[PDB]
Amino acid sequence: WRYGGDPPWPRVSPACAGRFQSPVDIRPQLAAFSPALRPLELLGFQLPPLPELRLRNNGHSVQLTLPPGLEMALGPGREYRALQLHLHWGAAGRPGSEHTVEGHRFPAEIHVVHLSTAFARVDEALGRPGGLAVLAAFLEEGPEENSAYEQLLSRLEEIAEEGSETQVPGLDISALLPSDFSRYFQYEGSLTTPPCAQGVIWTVFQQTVMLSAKQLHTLSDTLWGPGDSRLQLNFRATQPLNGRVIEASFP
Amino acid sequence: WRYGGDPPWPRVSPACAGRFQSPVDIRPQLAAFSPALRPLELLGFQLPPLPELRLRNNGHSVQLTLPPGLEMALGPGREYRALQLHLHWGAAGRPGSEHTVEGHRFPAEIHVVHLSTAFARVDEALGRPGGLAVLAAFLEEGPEENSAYEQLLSRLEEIAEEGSETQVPGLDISALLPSDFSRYFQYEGSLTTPPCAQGVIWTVFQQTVMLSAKQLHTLSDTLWGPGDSRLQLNFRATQPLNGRVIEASFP
Amino acid sequence: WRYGGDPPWPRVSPACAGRFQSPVDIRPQLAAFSPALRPLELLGFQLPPLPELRLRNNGHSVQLTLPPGLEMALGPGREYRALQLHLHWGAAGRPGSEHTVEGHRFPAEIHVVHLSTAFARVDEALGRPGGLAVLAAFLEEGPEENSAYEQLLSRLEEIAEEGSETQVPGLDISALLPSDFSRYFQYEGSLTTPPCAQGVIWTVFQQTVMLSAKQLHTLSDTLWGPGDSRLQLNFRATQPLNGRVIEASFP
Amino acid sequence: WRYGGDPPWPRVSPACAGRFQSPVDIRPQLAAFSPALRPLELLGFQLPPLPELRLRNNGHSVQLTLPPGLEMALGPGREYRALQLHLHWGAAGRPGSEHTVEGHRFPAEIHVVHLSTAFARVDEALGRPGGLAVLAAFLEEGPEENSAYEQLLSRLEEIAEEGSETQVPGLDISALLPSDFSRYFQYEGSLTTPPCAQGVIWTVFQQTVMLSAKQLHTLSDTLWGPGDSRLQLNFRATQPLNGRVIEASFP
Ligand SMILES: Cc1cc(-c2ccc(S(N)(=O)=O)s2)cnc1-c1cccc2ncccc12
Ligand SMILES: Cc1cc(-c2ccc(S(N)(=O)=O)s2)cnc1-c1cccc2ncccc12
Ligand SMILES: Cc1cc(-c2ccc(S(N)(=O)=O)s2)cnc1-c1cccc2ncccc12
Ligand SMILES: Cc1cc(-c2ccc(S(N)(=O)=O)s2)cnc1-c1cccc2ncccc12
Ligand SMILES: [Zn+2]
Ligand SMILES: [Zn+2]
Ligand SMILES: [Zn+2]
Ligand SMILES: [Zn+2]
Secondary structure (H helix, E strand, O other): OOOOOOOOHHHHOHHHHOOOOOOOEEOHHHOEEOOOOOOOEEEOOEOOOOOOEEEEEOOOOEEEEOOOOOEEEEEOOEEEEEEEEEEEEOEOOEOOOOOEEOOEEOOEEEEEEEEEOOOOOHHHHOOOOOOEEEEEEEEEEOOOOOHHHHHHHOOHHHHOOOOOEEEEOOOEHHHHOOOOOOOEEEEEEEOOOOOOOEEEEEEEEOOOEEEOHHHHHHHHHOOEOOOOOEOOOOOOOOOOOOOOOOEEOOO | OOOOOOOOHHHHOHHHHOOOOOOOEEOHHHOEEOOOOOOOEEEOOEOOOOOOEEEEEOOOOEEEEOOOOOEEEEEOOEEEEEEEEEEEEOEOOEOOOOOEEOOEEOOEEEEEEEEEOOOOOHHHHOOOOOOEEEEEEEEEEOOOOOHHHHHHHOOOHHHOOOOOEEEEOOOEHHHHOOOOOOOEEEEEEEOOOOOOOEEEEEEEEOOOEEEOHHHHHHHHHOOEEOOOEEOOOOOOOOOOOOOOOOEEOOO | OOOOOOOOHHHHOHHHHOOOOOOOEEOHHHOEEOOOOOOOEEEOOEOOOOOOEEEEEOOOOEEEEOOOOOEEEEEOOEEEEEEEEEEEEOEOOEOOOOOEEOOEEOOEEEEEEEEEOOOOOHHHHOOOOOOEEEEEEEEEEOOOOOHHHHHHHOOHHHHOOOOOEEEEOOOEHHHHOOOOOOOEEEEEEEOOOOOOOEEEEEEEEOOOEEEOHHHHHHHHHOOEOOOOOEOOOOOOOOOOOOOOOOEEOOO | OOOOOOOOHHHHOHHHHOOOOOOOEEOOOOOEEOOOOOOOEEEOOEOOOOOOEEEEEOOOOEEEEOOOOOEEEEEOOEEEEEEEEEEEEOEOOEOOOOOEEOOEEOOEEEEEEEEEOOOOOHHHHOOOOOOEEEEEEEEEEOOOOOHHHHHHHOOHHHHOOOOOEEEEOOOEHHHHOOOOOOOEEEEEEEOOOOOOOEEEEEEEEOOOEEEOHHHHHHHHHOOEOOOOOEOOOOOOOOOOOOOOOOEEOOO
16 A cells, blocks of 8 residues: 555555544634543653664654553543654645644644553554554744754664664654643544554644754655655545544643 | 336336425525434444445446444434445436436435334335435545545446446445535435335435545446446436425524 | 223333323424424315214223325325324313423313325334324313314213213314414324324424313213223323424424 | 442452442532533334343342344444443432432432444453443432333332343333433443443433332332342442543533
């Protein structure tokens, strides 16, 4: 499977033809303020340099494999463990986030994918209610260089080839995310690539992360994908809510 | 019986000349708003990949057989089980929906046919009020490839020949339907082919679903009907309301 | 089965414990105006004097059996034939209507019971959507002797014994009903006695029918029922709407 | 294990000492209104008289086994099938509900236990978030005999001895529940008996159901439990929220 071309995703994974897919257009007006949504809590995201982490160009994204012991709570009794994070991006002067807000697409997007602690294996969690959870943040152009992101972006040249990997020092994974953990949207959806399993809890931060224009250009211009092709515009088309209500943790 | 030339349908089925037939032209300004029309309830429609579903070219449409367990309600205690779905379509740049809206014919139309749970058999329900209910949705052209419809459309080549059939993976049947289950038109009418039985409750979604130009081309151009003849323009002409008022679930 | 005492009605017929029973309390402010509800049409209700009709004290009510050829339509394509009518009433100083309006119980009530023309036999219509329709009107005191009701009431003395019957000349049955057929409530419920079968379309007139004080006393004070007891208070307690929305033909 | 005596529940079943147990005390003023909570959908619950259903004294409660095809939804795509229902009650002069509201215990409580359709088997669903869902309604004292409850309460004398069982006619299960399906409290908790598995979505109806005092007495006073003693006060003490915020579908 690939972005742009065939095979059609429902041929690859039936679940990709579900009614409750991701990503979606967040319309803050139509969102339901729910005071029960408490601030997100992360434990163990401040990683030391060793052991090193695998960073891979899988031909679809750049993926950082995360070690054991990164814990995340969506609220009391809703506990998760981090597995991996990765990015979706555009091209030169073309934004490439997955989620939109009132039709606006942002330059890029970070996903941190988590497994519910009630499940030992991802294959048992797929398609089950609350089995996986993804934390998402928009990346926008800012004036300053983001130095947390520079640790990853400076390594992209080594994995320009599709299907290539390198090892990188551990870092503060939470410094790749916004500092406001109390203001977010939350909805139930799917993985935005095959196998497109539903039951996934998406938390989209309201605060954005700022990268420099150079950093954004490094992300979008360095990696190669299937064919003689650049790895760009690696985002799925917006998917209808189909009656789902996005909640918001703030009025 | 066939679409196109003879026989005239009142000769095969005299019920086709009844006073209360389908389809009809929907004129939203003349529809009667009733707040008693609640959102449609469709449960059990998210099918697993196995078992597989029979898909058949019957000469008149492409038809997907639905298993037990797809429950639908039009109101409190007014419950239904889905039997089958099928489609009506046009030809190259000629629309072939059955219902029209203020004279406008849409590219195509999906029908999900149901049996009242008050009747153990279809043949007891034929001609009895509310024995059969059909959910109808309009298919329009949009920019994106539609995932739910691709699962069906990619299999038509396998069944191009009149009378041929195949077996397809389970899919979310509800994904084939518009976003807002609270917005529809409703009236009583007939089956749109022989035997033209009356007492059918038609529910026509207000919102459409979108397929790509190529998807709509695949639908109209792949299947063959009776004779050495294409399966196309498989819609009945618009019938008079004869005093019936179409209702609306929305002001 | 009897009013007042045992056996409990669900043991006689399990449908008497359905969620969607009659009668109900009509709260006109919670009723949904639907302009699809047109004036009721009756045809054949003006009977010649011969053949005579049977008027029976069945222990629960006084019931008039109607002949063939009385036709009623709730709207275009919604056609019914009248089977019988009967009354429900209270006792001296106590109202006995079945339906209530904003908690007000009226002196008495008339029910005219019909079978959908889609069905040859009552037993096939029971529990089926729209299979049976009842027209209901409240009876109140006015200043004049009602001459249509007098033809029935003047014979009650003859059928005072439980299980007794008499022959009465045909009359204008529609003169037992209000002259305003355009203003009414309509909802879906049940028979108000065993078998308590659901799917029954109830139409309750806004306008009442007027009987003299003496006529109302004849109704409540002449007939005898099970035991050595008066046939009085022959109404079921108000049943909860349980989420059903009563419609009104007027704003 | 049993109600009243030894052993203490965390010895039989250490999950009973988990941090997120049920039942809880609902303080409506501290509940979080979330407008994403939509009306409950229950299809299939109107059962015919045959086949019959197993009703069983199990020493801890009276339990009705429900057949396949009772479908229930908490939200879009979030579907369940009903397994069984059972009751919790007090004794002569003392209430026996499990949940309390602002400290108030109600005479009794009904639980309808469901399995997520994302899981083929109950044993897969235990301890998994959303795996099981219970619908709970309080039973209060009212003036009238309840028709729906009488079908069960009248059959209790035939199963009075611990471990005995009977077959009952099919009944409308929805008729045992409150009128307004849009108004409920919801939180995540546990089974209220061993094995005390967590992950259970509890939905507690705002509105009560009403039973005659005779009916409540039949419930509390007819059944025999463990030892040679009565089956009564079969409720668990209220448990701490430990940070859980209870949600309400209504302001
Ligand atoms: C968790 C997972 C997510 C994904 C994703 C696809 C798309 C996303 S995104 N764009 O965040 O929704 S996440 C793919 N495969 C796996 C996966 C699938 C199967 C086994 C796995 N074992 C360990 C780690 C990951 C495994
Ligand atoms: C359910 C049914 C729908 C249809 C349809 C004809 C036309 C439509 S459409 N365009 O939805 O109105 S649906 C035709 N025949 C049957 C049918 C008719 C008679 C007996 C049957 N027995 C088993 C299954 C189907 C039976
Ligand atoms: C139609 C019918 C109504 C009723 C009742 C009718 C109406 C009520 S009331 N209070 O109007 O709802 S109870 C009882 N039995 C039958 C009935 C049941 C079965 C066969 C019948 N054949 C002829 C006429 C009536 C038959
Ligand atoms: C579904 C189920 C609920 C319960 C319940 C215990 C307590 C409740 S209550 N008070 O609703 O919370 S429900 C007990 N056993 C089963 C059950 C039923 C069937 C198979 C099972 N296998 C393993 C464990 C439990 C099984
Ligand atoms: Zn992603
Ligand atoms: Zn059709
Ligand atoms: Zn009656
Ligand atoms: Zn319980």
